[PDB]
């Protein structure tokens, strides 16, 4: 689950459970932030069209 979330990129000698929850929260925030950026891009495109 940690490998699925953070990839192989972090050579963290120790994986923690707080670290697992943090990377899970980050995936959820990255999806939310990309939806918000897409919605801003839709508004900009709608304003250009108008």
């Amino acid at each position: 689950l940690y490998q699925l979330l953070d990839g192989d990129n972090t050579q963290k000698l120790f994986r923690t459970y707080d670290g697992l929850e943090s990377v899970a929260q980050k995936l959820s925030q990255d999806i939310a932030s990309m939806r918000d950026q897409l919605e801003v891009s839709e508004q900009e495109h709608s304003l250009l069209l108008s």
Partner: protein, 102 residues
């Protein structure tokens, strides 16, 4: 006789006090490969779903973070996170397309 009698003094009350501190589910052993008896509490299905596991509070925070409902199968967790990563990659492509079109 005095020495061995002193060892056995309050024996029942010593054992009962130690027994009171034990987690009964930790005694329940299961065999996955026929040879290795593991405590049922060490099975990943139970660590992730059992309300009496010490890790239950941590896996609850992970499920809320990934928006996985608590009624779902614990084996569905990695497949759900893999589909969330697929969704993130799709939204990245979509934003790149739309920014190039603008």
């Amino acid at each position: 006789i005095i020495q061995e009698s002193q060892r056995l003094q309050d024996s029942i009350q010593k054992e009962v006090k130690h027994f009171s501190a034990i987690c009964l589910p930790a005694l329940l052993k299961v065999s996955t490969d026929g040879f290795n008896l593991l405590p049922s509490r060490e099975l990943s299905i139970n660590r992730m779903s059992n309300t009496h596991a010490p890790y239950y509070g941590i896996f609850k925070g992970i499920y809320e973070s990934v928006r996985l409902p608590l009624y779902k199968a614990p084996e569905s967790v990695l497949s759900h996170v893999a589909d969330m990563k697929k969704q993130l990659f799709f939204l990245r492509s979509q934003l790149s397309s739309r920014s190039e079109a603008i």
